[PDB]
Amino acid sequence: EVETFAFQAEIAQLMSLIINTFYSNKEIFLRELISNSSDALDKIRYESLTDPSKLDSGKELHINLIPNKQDRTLTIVDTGIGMTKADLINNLGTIAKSGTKAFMEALQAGADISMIGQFGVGFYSAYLVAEKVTVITKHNDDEQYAWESSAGGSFTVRTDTGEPMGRGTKVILHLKEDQTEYLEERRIKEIVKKHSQFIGYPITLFVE
Ligand SMILES: COCCOc1cc(C)nc(N)n1
Ligand SMILES: [Mg+2]
Protein backbone atom coordinates (compact mmCIF):
# COMPACT_ATOMS: atom_id res chain seq x y z
CA GLU A 1 0.00 0.00 0.00
CA VAL A 2 2.40 2.76 1.29
CA GLU A 3 6.18 2.84 0.76
CA THR A 4 8.34 5.16 2.91
CA PHE A 5 11.63 6.71 1.72
CA ALA A 6 14.41 8.88 3.10
CA PHE A 7 15.14 12.13 1.24
CA GLN A 8 18.76 12.13 -0.01
CA ALA A 9 20.79 14.19 2.52
CA GLU A 10 21.09 17.33 0.32
CA ILE A 11 17.33 17.54 -0.47
CA ALA A 12 16.46 17.08 3.24
CA GLN A 13 18.88 19.95 3.94
CA LEU A 14 17.30 22.06 1.22
CA MET A 15 13.82 21.53 2.69
CA SER A 16 15.15 22.49 6.21
CA LEU A 17 16.70 25.67 4.89
CA ILE A 18 13.41 26.52 3.11
CA ILE A 19 11.28 25.75 6.20
CA ASN A 20 13.59 27.57 8.69
CA THR A 21 15.22 30.61 7.09
CA PHE A 22 13.37 33.81 7.96
CA TYR A 23 12.19 35.01 4.52
CA SER A 24 9.08 37.19 4.22
CA ASN A 25 8.59 37.04 0.41
CA LYS A 26 6.82 33.61 0.52
CA GLU A 27 4.46 34.24 -2.41
CA ILE A 28 7.03 33.25 -4.97
CA PHE A 29 6.02 29.65 -4.12
CA LEU A 30 3.05 30.00 -6.53
CA ARG A 31 5.22 31.39 -9.32
CA GLU A 32 7.47 28.36 -9.04
CA LEU A 33 4.65 25.80 -9.05
CA ILE A 34 2.84 27.42 -11.93
CA SER A 35 6.14 27.64 -13.74
CA ASN A 36 6.66 23.90 -13.06
CA SER A 37 3.26 23.02 -14.53
CA SER A 38 4.08 25.13 -17.57
CA ASP A 39 7.35 23.13 -18.20
CA ALA A 40 5.39 19.84 -17.89
CA LEU A 41 2.78 21.08 -20.32
CA ASP A 42 5.65 22.10 -22.67
CA LYS A 43 6.98 18.53 -22.56
CA ILE A 44 3.70 16.92 -23.50
CA ARG A 45 3.16 19.52 -26.19
CA TYR A 46 6.64 18.60 -27.54
CA GLU A 47 6.09 14.86 -27.39
CA SER A 48 2.72 15.10 -29.06
CA LEU A 49 4.09 17.04 -32.04
CA THR A 50 5.53 13.77 -33.43
CA ASP A 51 3.16 11.30 -31.72
CA PRO A 52 -0.43 12.75 -31.60
CA SER A 53 -1.72 9.78 -29.53
CA LYS A 54 0.13 11.13 -26.45
CA LEU A 55 -2.80 13.48 -26.04
CA ASP A 56 -5.22 10.53 -25.98
CA SER A 57 -5.35 10.91 -22.19
CA GLY A 58 -6.55 14.52 -22.76
CA LYS A 59 -6.30 17.24 -25.46
CA GLU A 60 -6.66 20.21 -23.12
CA LEU A 61 -3.48 21.81 -21.79
CA HIS A 62 -4.29 24.02 -18.79
CA ILE A 63 -3.46 25.05 -15.20
CA ASN A 64 -6.08 25.25 -12.45
CA LEU A 65 -5.70 26.83 -9.07
CA ILE A 66 -8.17 25.48 -6.51
CA PRO A 67 -8.37 27.10 -3.07
CA ASN A 68 -10.33 25.25 -0.36
CA LYS A 69 -10.84 26.92 3.06
CA GLN A 70 -12.56 23.92 4.53
CA ASP A 71 -9.54 21.66 4.11
CA ARG A 72 -7.13 24.61 4.29
CA THR A 73 -5.58 23.58 0.92
CA LEU A 74 -4.49 25.23 -2.32
CA THR A 75 -4.22 22.82 -5.27
CA ILE A 76 -2.27 23.52 -8.51
CA VAL A 77 -3.50 21.04 -11.17
CA ASP A 78 -2.13 20.69 -14.71
CA THR A 79 -2.53 18.38 -17.65
CA GLY A 80 1.24 18.26 -18.24
CA ILE A 81 3.41 15.24 -18.92
CA GLY A 82 3.06 14.00 -15.32
CA MET A 83 5.53 11.65 -13.63
CA THR A 84 6.17 7.89 -13.61
CA LYS A 85 6.72 6.24 -10.19
CA ALA A 86 10.50 6.18 -10.84
CA ASP A 87 10.60 9.97 -11.30
CA LEU A 88 8.37 10.75 -8.33
CA ILE A 89 10.90 8.87 -6.21
CA ASN A 90 13.86 10.61 -7.87
CA ASN A 91 13.04 14.02 -6.49
CA LEU A 92 9.99 14.48 -8.76
CA GLY A 93 12.12 14.36 -11.96
CA THR A 94 14.49 17.17 -10.88
CA ILE A 95 18.24 17.13 -10.37
CA ALA A 96 17.80 18.19 -6.70
CA LYS A 97 21.25 17.10 -5.44
CA SER A 98 23.37 19.17 -7.84
CA GLY A 99 20.56 21.72 -8.18
CA THR A 100 20.72 22.12 -4.38
CA LYS A 101 24.49 22.43 -4.55
CA ALA A 102 24.38 25.15 -7.20
CA PHE A 103 21.54 26.88 -5.27
CA MET A 104 23.47 26.75 -2.02
CA GLU A 105 26.65 28.17 -3.54
CA ALA A 106 24.47 30.84 -5.19
CA LEU A 107 23.12 31.75 -1.77
CA GLN A 108 26.64 32.02 -0.31
CA ALA A 109 27.20 34.67 -3.01
CA GLY A 110 24.23 37.02 -2.59
CA ALA A 111 21.45 35.05 -4.25
CA ASP A 112 18.22 34.92 -2.33
CA ILE A 113 15.62 32.16 -1.93
CA SER A 114 13.35 33.61 -4.62
CA MET A 115 15.99 32.43 -7.08
CA ILE A 116 15.45 28.78 -6.14
CA GLY A 117 13.74 28.23 -9.48
CA GLN A 118 16.87 28.96 -11.54
CA PHE A 119 18.35 25.83 -9.92
CA GLY A 120 15.64 23.35 -10.87
CA VAL A 121 14.34 22.74 -7.36
CA GLY A 122 11.59 25.40 -7.17
CA PHE A 123 9.18 22.62 -6.28
CA TYR A 124 10.50 22.61 -2.72
CA SER A 125 9.49 26.23 -2.28
CA ALA A 126 6.06 24.75 -1.66
CA TYR A 127 7.48 24.47 1.90
CA LEU A 128 7.57 28.22 2.30
CA VAL A 129 3.80 27.90 2.98
CA ALA A 130 2.78 24.23 3.29
CA GLU A 131 3.29 22.07 6.34
CA LYS A 132 2.40 19.12 4.15
CA VAL A 133 2.50 18.59 0.37
CA THR A 134 0.69 15.84 -1.56
CA VAL A 135 1.45 15.29 -5.27
CA ILE A 136 -0.99 13.15 -7.30
CA THR A 137 0.53 12.44 -10.69
CA LYS A 138 -0.31 10.37 -13.77
CA HIS A 139 1.99 9.79 -16.76
CA ASN A 140 0.93 8.05 -19.96
CA ASP A 141 3.48 5.26 -19.33
CA ASP A 142 2.48 4.36 -15.74
CA GLU A 143 -0.15 4.14 -12.99
CA GLN A 144 -1.48 7.12 -10.98
CA TYR A 145 0.52 7.65 -7.77
CA ALA A 146 0.47 9.78 -4.69
CA TRP A 147 3.62 11.23 -3.16
CA GLU A 148 3.45 12.84 0.22
CA SER A 149 5.78 14.50 2.70
CA SER A 150 5.66 16.76 5.71
CA ALA A 151 9.44 17.24 5.46
CA GLY A 152 11.25 15.68 8.42
CA GLY A 153 13.53 13.68 6.13
CA SER A 154 11.07 11.17 4.68
CA PHE A 155 8.41 10.89 2.00
CA THR A 156 5.78 8.33 1.00
CA VAL A 157 4.68 7.02 -2.35
CA ARG A 158 1.50 4.95 -2.87
CA THR A 159 -0.64 4.03 -5.85
CA ASP A 160 -3.53 6.44 -5.96
CA THR A 161 -6.90 4.91 -6.61
CA GLY A 162 -8.78 8.19 -5.89
CA GLU A 163 -10.06 10.27 -8.78
CA PRO A 164 -8.58 8.95 -12.05
CA MET A 165 -7.13 12.11 -13.50
CA GLY A 166 -6.19 11.06 -17.03
CA ARG A 167 -2.85 12.84 -17.25
CA GLY A 168 -0.96 15.50 -15.34
CA THR A 169 0.06 16.45 -11.79
CA LYS A 170 -1.81 17.90 -8.78
CA VAL A 171 0.12 19.66 -6.03
CA ILE A 172 -1.97 19.85 -2.85
CA LEU A 173 -0.58 22.36 -0.36
CA HIS A 174 -1.79 21.83 3.16
CA LEU A 175 -1.16 25.42 4.19
CA LYS A 176 0.59 26.49 7.35
CA GLU A 177 -1.96 27.69 9.89
CA ASP A 178 -0.85 31.26 9.33
CA GLN A 179 -0.56 31.35 5.51
CA THR A 180 -4.27 31.22 4.73
CA GLU A 181 -3.95 34.45 2.78
CA TYR A 182 -3.10 32.19 -0.19
CA LEU A 183 -6.68 30.91 -0.17
CA GLU A 184 -8.02 34.43 -0.75
CA GLU A 185 -9.27 34.98 -4.29
CA ARG A 186 -7.89 38.54 -4.41
CA ARG A 187 -4.51 37.46 -3.12
CA ILE A 188 -4.16 34.67 -5.66
CA LYS A 189 -5.11 37.01 -8.51
CA GLU A 190 -2.55 39.61 -7.43
CA ILE A 191 0.18 37.01 -7.30
CA VAL A 192 -0.67 35.36 -10.65
CA LYS A 193 -0.81 38.79 -12.29
CA LYS A 194 2.49 39.94 -10.77
CA HIS A 195 4.59 36.81 -11.38
CA SER A 196 2.95 34.65 -14.03
CA GLN A 197 1.08 37.12 -16.28
CA PHE A 198 2.73 35.73 -19.41
CA ILE A 199 2.48 31.95 -18.91
CA GLY A 200 1.52 30.34 -22.21
CA TYR A 201 -1.36 28.32 -20.76
CA PRO A 202 -4.87 29.25 -19.54
CA ILE A 203 -4.76 29.58 -15.74
CA THR A 204 -8.19 29.15 -14.07
CA LEU A 205 -8.68 30.32 -10.52
CA PHE A 206 -11.60 28.28 -9.12
CA VAL A 207 -14.10 30.03 -6.87
CA GLU A 208 -15.49 28.78 -3.58
C1 LIG B 1 8.39 19.75 -15.01
O1 LIG B 1 8.45 18.42 -15.50
C2 LIG B 1 8.47 17.46 -14.44
C3 LIG B 1 7.49 16.34 -14.75
O2 LIG B 1 6.22 16.64 -14.18
C4 LIG B 1 6.11 17.62 -13.23
C5 LIG B 1 7.11 17.80 -12.29
C6 LIG B 1 6.97 18.80 -11.34
C7 LIG B 1 8.05 19.02 -10.31
N1 LIG B 1 5.87 19.59 -11.35
C8 LIG B 1 4.91 19.40 -12.28
N2 LIG B 1 3.81 20.19 -12.27
N3 LIG B 1 5.02 18.42 -13.21
MG1 LIG C 1 -10.70 23.51 -16.62
UniProtKB/Swiss-Prot annotation:
<feature type="region of interest" description="Interaction with NR3C1">
    <location>
        <begin position="1"/>
        <end position="208"/>
    </location>
</feature>
<comment type="similarity">
    <text>Belongs to the heat shock protein 90 family.</text>
</comment>
<feature type="binding site">
    <location>
        <position position="36"/>
    </location>
    <ligand>
        <name>ATP</name>
    </ligand>
</feature>
<feature type="modified residue" description="N6-acetyllysine">
    <location>
        <position position="69"/>
    </location>
</feature>
<feature type="binding site">
    <location>
        <position position="97"/>
    </location>
    <ligand>
        <name>ATP</name>
    </ligand>
</feature>
<comment type="function">
    <text>(Microbial infection) Seems to interfere with N.meningitidis NadA-mediated invasion of human cells. Decreasing HSP90 levels increases adhesion and entry of E.coli expressing NadA into human Chang cells; increasing its levels leads to decreased adhesion and invasion.</text>
</comment>
<comment type="subunit">
    <text>(Microbial infection) Interacts with herpes simplex virus 1 protein US11; this interaction inhibits TBK1-induced interferon production.</text>
</comment>
<comment type="function">
    <text>Molecular chaperone that promotes the maturation, structural maintenance and proper regulation of specific target proteins involved for instance in cell cycle control and signal transduction. Undergoes a functional cycle that is linked to its ATPase activity which is essential for its chaperone activity. This cycle probably induces conformational changes in the client proteins, thereby causing their activation. Interacts dynamically with various co-chaperones that modulate its substrate recognition, ATPase cycle and chaperone function.</text>
</comment>
<feature type="binding site">
    <location>
        <position position="123"/>
    </location>
    <ligand>
        <name>ATP</name>
    </ligand>
</feature>
<feature type="modified residue" description="N6-acetyllysine">
    <location>
        <position position="43"/>
    </location>
</feature>
<feature type="binding site">
    <location>
        <position position="78"/>
    </location>
    <ligand>
        <name>ATP</name>
    </ligand>
</feature>
<comment type="subunit">
    <text>Homodimer. Identified in NR3C1/GCR steroid receptor-chaperone complexes formed at least by NR3C1, HSP90AA1 and a variety of proteins containing TPR repeats such as FKBP4, FKBP5, PPID, PPP5C or STIP1. Forms a complex containing HSP90AA1, TSC1 and TSC2; TSC1 is required to recruit TCS2 to the complex. The closed form interacts (via the middle domain and TPR repeat-binding motif) with co-chaperone TSC1 (via C-terminus). Interacts with TOM34. Interacts with TERT; the interaction, together with PTGES3, is required for correct assembly and stabilization of the TERT holoenzyme complex.</text>
</comment>
<protein>
    <recommendedName>
        <fullName>Heat shock protein HSP 90-alpha</fullName>
    </recommendedName>
</protein>
